[PDB]
């Protein structure tokens with residue numbers, strides 16, 4: 001459902017959070033287009049407690 | 063699946079995640095549901111009840 005980083009929950013502005021076995025990517029809902037999570041790809045709002053199912057991961061800041 | 067099983071092959075979709083995409087179809091951001099999904103469930107079942 002979301003990605004945790006520095007105590008901040010990251011949600012995909014458009015697309016779906018996916019992983020193959022190890023690496024995390026965000027892709028659309030009608031075509032598998034894997035792209036690395038980037039600040040411009042997600043928006044942060046809140047903390048890593050209210051959500052259920054959040055996954056610890058790193059985010060790459062451009 | 064949600065809305066997928068009418069277009070073509072039915073792709074599995076977590077129901078907690080299906081709502082966030084249904085909320086996003088009404089101009090309501092995804093994190094609105096996730097932050098209070100317990101209230102959503104508690105309130106949806108009461109209305110069905």
Ligand SMILES: *[C@@H]1O[C@H](CO)[C@@H](O)[C@H](O)[C@H]1NC(C)=O
Pocket residue numbers: 020021022023034
């Ligand atoms: C997942 O994909 C990335 C890049 O596409 C690759 O580096 C990684 O090894 C893949 N992991 C698995 C388990 O296939």
Ligand SMILES: *[C@@H]1O[C@H](CO)[C@@H](O)[C@H](O)[C@H]1NC(C)=O
Pocket residue numbers: 004054055056
């Ligand atoms: C993510 O990391 C934080 C700090 O290291 C930890 O408190 C939390 O339990 C971790 N979450 C998971 C799902 O491992």
